[PDB]
Design a binder for this molecule. Structure first.
Ligand SMILES: Nc1ncnc2c1ncn2[C@@H]1O[C@H](COP(=O)(O)OP(=O)(O)O)[C@@H](O)[C@H]1O
Ligand code: BEF
Ligand SMILES: [Mg+2]
Lengths: 98, 107, 511, 93, 88
């Protein structure tokens, strides 16, 4: 029979891995074109610095990261272990961000 | 006489002449006291060492010889005083304190 | 080393006193110690270990090559493309294998499209040499590494541009005999990473090879030249201001003779026109066609920035794509079913002449090759090839390794009905032979004329039994006109010296 | 172009605390980043207080109080000493 | 034929992939994830982005440039009270 792990043991292992890791988790090429997409609705035809292009992601992640752990707090208080968007929106509302 | 740096005169390491210029162009006031560039400049040394000493401590705990932002991230965020101080500071490449919720631990 | 360095100068100093001047123009290690003491004080029979006949100039190149070996001096086999220079090398490797009886470690480099040919020709002519096509995956390259490459169970190894960079570390530990470099065009840049991986290996000789000489600049010339004999020059701008760029200020054009005089006994050029080996030249026509009226809307929409709300970060390319093909701009094809009909040839400027010429060459039996810059544009041609129901094979950048071989074989198969042949420019034509074809057409022009020359001679080599009829496509009243003029500009700044070298809102609140 | 920064002084203080520990460059940039911030936050805070009492010249009285305002708890307590010690040392010297 | 138009479906915002999203969530410490999160995240991240980007671009023209600088965006971050160290 196949040796499948109990579901979640893998995830806790994963949770450990990244919490020691420090690198980005978002692919650069998809990432910057997103910004290059966005710039058009403000001013046409800008020219981005990679340092700036890089600098975006950290805020991009660090922001979303702090979001996650708060959202994780939600289901726990809501006595869950699986996150719902209602948690996510809730924090942002608690963050007063709507 | 003989030229003697103010930082030496205070027995400090930080360049006070730099800041007294910087305060002078910093447009914080049209006049500036003399010990103020001094007064701050030493406290400047205090916090850097305070963080640097912490930066040294964590640097040892993985048995490295050179300090990195992850160490810096760990140190300040492991310090409740610094973390309270730098709560609106996000650290480049610093990563996160490893912390798993109690309820995510398996029965 | 130094004995060879003394022994190199035995042949280097026998030329003009210019080498002493360069040694004394350094602004100096102990090369002077061995220079001062000197200052004050075959096989022309086409050897039959090959299986065939060597051409007369081929033997001369080999004999010239064996002289460089006996001189222990370096050089560049710069003979014009398609003159059987591969046979010259295969004979030369036999020269070392049999006359001197040293079958050893050898390293040769080919573009991805061409690794088949060199292994194919080495088997055909000198089957006694152990060579591999070092291809495959990370694991699939490993069993080559430890089993045969680490086992020293080979003579030559055939790899690609990037593989050696992927395999620099397992290759340093093996000292080589030559680093055979075909189509040595990536080395034009010193900072091209392939250059820094090749100055690290340790081979007794370093035989650089090309199809075309330097492309643009004297800086480029000694970029090829500096890796030839590095301990001799060891200088970058010293070489440059020594010659002062063909007298860019005085235009004496006589100091160029000094450039020619050093390189003539140091390097070898032969041209196809002199020793034909094919006895038939090639034709060329530049099919100036008007830029399509249908796309004139979008071409104005690019010039006047009228379709809208996108990038123009490189107006070069944007006009270049419109100069190339209209449907490339993501909306020129409005059909949700994306109809495939005569509208494509209708809306396109070129394809109307292409449809005419394809009909003519179909009846004439001309086996045509098509070159282009945009792989995406080739998709449309692939679609339009489906429309006309022609057999063909599409080679593009990074298709496969075995697919390249099989598509080449089917196209070059005897009596191959594959009437057309889709191919790129910078991935396709860098050494392959297509003598089954006669006519080669460019859809678009490239900012590199020698590459344009490199590509065109694909079918016009040894083995071409028909007249090569070139039909370049240039758009009338277009920016492509300036590129070709600039292409000529880079052409004539280079051809003039090469010919001398051989011879000698408000109030609207939402609330 | 010339660019002036704080690396050398930070490098000196490190060898005061850890005379053997090395350092990266990016983290040094962080330190340069950090120092300028706290440099800024104190000064404008220092400025506006002089505004609050309508004075025109910034001295240590100004500097110290905001340090008490800016640094929390023990750092403010300890650093004021760090400030206090140097000032008297300077006036004496 | 008819293959020159067979892939026109980029539509960037999914470029932030589910594997990354979970990889992101895994670093954050979430053990199990709803599937609608991925899309909802795409909204939260984007709406975040321009507000700075607007502010980030908002600088640029005022200094009469055409190339966004990190320092520029560095100031962009400060204004909403999330400061970063490490790009000068
Ligand atoms: N002396 C010769 N005898 C027989 N065939 C030759 C000879 N010289 C060239 N050829 C043929 O001409 C073609 C030219 O290919 P190659 O030698 O690779 O030229 P290049 O190296 O310039 O591409 C080869 O396929 C080869 O079979
Ligand atoms: F003339 Be060789 F094929 F580059
Ligand atoms: Mg040849």
């Amino acid at each position: 029979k196949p040796h499948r792990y109990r579901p979640g043991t893998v995830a806790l292992r994963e949770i450990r891995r990244y919490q020691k890791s420090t690198e980005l988790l978002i692919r650069k090429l998809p990432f910057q074109r997103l910004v290059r997409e966005i710039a058009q609705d403000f001013k046409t035809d800008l020219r981005f610095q990679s340092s700036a292009v890089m600098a975006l992601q950290e805020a991009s992640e660090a922001y979303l990261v702090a979001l996650f752990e708060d959202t994780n707090l939600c289901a726990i208080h809501a006595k869950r272990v699986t996150i719902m968007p209602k948690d996510i929106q809730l924090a942002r509302r608690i963050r007063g961000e709507r | 006489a003989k030229a003697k740096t103010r930082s030496s005169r205070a027995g400090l390491q930080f360049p006070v002449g730099r800041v007294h210029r910087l305060l002078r162009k910093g447009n914080y006031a049209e006049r500036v006291g003399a010990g103020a560039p001094v007064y701050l400049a030493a406290v400047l040394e205090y916090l850097t060492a305070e963080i640097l000493e912490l930066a040294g401590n964590a640097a040892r705990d993985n048995k490295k010889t050179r300090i990195i932002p992850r160490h810096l991230q760990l140190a300040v965020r492991n310090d409740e005083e610094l973390n309270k101080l730098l709560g609106r500071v996000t650290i480049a490449q610093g990563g996160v304190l490893p912390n798993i919720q109690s309820v995510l631990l398996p029965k | 080393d130094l004995e060879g360095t003394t022994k190199r100068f035995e042949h280097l100093l026998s030329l003009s006193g210019l080498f002493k001047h360069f040694i004394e123009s350094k602004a100096d290690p102990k090369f002077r110690q061995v220079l001062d003491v000197l200052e004050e004080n075959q096989f022309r029979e086409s050897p039959a270990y090959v299986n065939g006949q060597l051409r007369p100039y081929q033997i001369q190149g080999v004999n010239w090559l064996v002289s460089l070996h006996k001189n222990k001096i370096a050089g560049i086999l710069a003979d014009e493309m398609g003159l059987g220079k591969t046979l010259q090398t295969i004979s030369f490797l036999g020269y070392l294998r049999y006359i001197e009886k040293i079958p050893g470690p050898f390293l040769v480099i080919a573009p991805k499209s061409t690794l088949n040919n060199w292994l194919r020709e080495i088997n055909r002519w000198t089957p006694d040499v152990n060579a591999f096509i070092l291809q495959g995956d990370k694991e699939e390259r490993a069993e080559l590494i430890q089993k045969k490459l680490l086992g020293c169970d080979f003579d030559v190894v055939i790899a690609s541009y990037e593989i050696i960079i992927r395999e620099k570390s397992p290759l340093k530990k093996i000292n080589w005999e030559y680093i055979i470099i075909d189509e040595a065009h990536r080395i034009k840049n010193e900072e091209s990473m392939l250059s820094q991986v090749l100055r690290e290996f340790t081979s007794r000789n370093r035989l650089l090879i090309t199809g075309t000489p330097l492309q643009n600049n004297l800086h480029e010339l000694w970029a090829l030249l500096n890796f030839l004999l590095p301990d001799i020059f060891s200088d970058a701008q010293d070489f440059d201001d020594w010659f002062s760029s063909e007298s860019t200020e005085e235009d004496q054009d006589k100091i160029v003779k000094q450039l020619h005089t050093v390189l003539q006994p140091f390097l070898l050029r032969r041209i196809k026109s002199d020793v034909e080996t094919s006895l038939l030249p090639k034709k060329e026509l530049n099919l100036y066609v008007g830029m399509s009226s249908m796309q004139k809307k979008w071409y104005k929409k690019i010039l006047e920035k009228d379709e809208s709300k996108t990038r123009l970060l490189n107006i070069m390319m944007q006009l270049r794509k419109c100069c190339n093909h209209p449907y490339l701009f993501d909306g020129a094809e409005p059909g949700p079913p994306y109809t495939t009909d005569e509208h494509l040839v209708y809306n396109a400027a070129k394809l109307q002449v292409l449809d005419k010429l394809l009909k003519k060459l179909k009846e004439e039996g001309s086996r045509v090759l098509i070159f282009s810059q945009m792989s995406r544009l080739l998709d449309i041609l692939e679609d339009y090839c489906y429309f006309r129901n022609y057999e063909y094979c599409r080679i593009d950048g990074s298709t496969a390794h075995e697919d390249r071989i099989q598509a080449i074989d089917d196209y070059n198969a005897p009596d191959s009905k594959k009437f057309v042949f889709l191919l790129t420019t910078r991935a396709g034509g860098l050494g392959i032979n297509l003598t089954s074809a006669d006519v080669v057409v460019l859809y678009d022009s490239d900012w590199n004329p020698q590459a344009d020359l490199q590509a065109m001679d694909r079918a016009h080599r040894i083995g071409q039994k028909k007249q090569v009829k070139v039909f370049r496509l240039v758009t009338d009243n277009s920016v492509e006109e300036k590129i070709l003029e600039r292409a000529t500009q880079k052409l004539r700044l280079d051809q003039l010296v090469i010919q001398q070298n051989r011879t000698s809102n408000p109030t609207k609140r939402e609330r | 172009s010339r660019k002036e920064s704080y690396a050398i002084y930070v490098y000196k203080v490190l060898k005061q605390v850890h005379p053997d520990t090395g350092i990266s460059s990016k983290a040094m940039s962080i330190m340069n980043s950090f120092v300028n911030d706290v440099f800024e936050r104190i000064a404008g805070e220092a400025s506006r207080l002089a505004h609050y009492n309508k004075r025109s010249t910034i001295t240590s009285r100004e500097i110290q109080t905001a340090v008490r305002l800016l640094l929390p708890g023990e750092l403010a307590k300890h650093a004021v000493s760090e400030g206090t010690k140097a000032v008297t040392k300077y006036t004496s010297a | 034929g008819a293959k020159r138009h067979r892939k026109v479906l980029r539509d960037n915002i999914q470029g932030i992939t589910k594997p990354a999203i979970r990889r992101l969530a895994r670093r954050g410490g979430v053990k199990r994830i709803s599937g609608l999160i991925y899309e909802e995240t795409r909204g939260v991240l984007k709406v975040f982005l321009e507000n700075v980007i607007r502010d980030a671009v908002t600088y640029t023209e005022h200094a009469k440039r055409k190339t966004v600088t990190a320092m520029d965006v560095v100031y962009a971050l400060k204004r909403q009270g999330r400061t970063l160290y490490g790009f000068g």
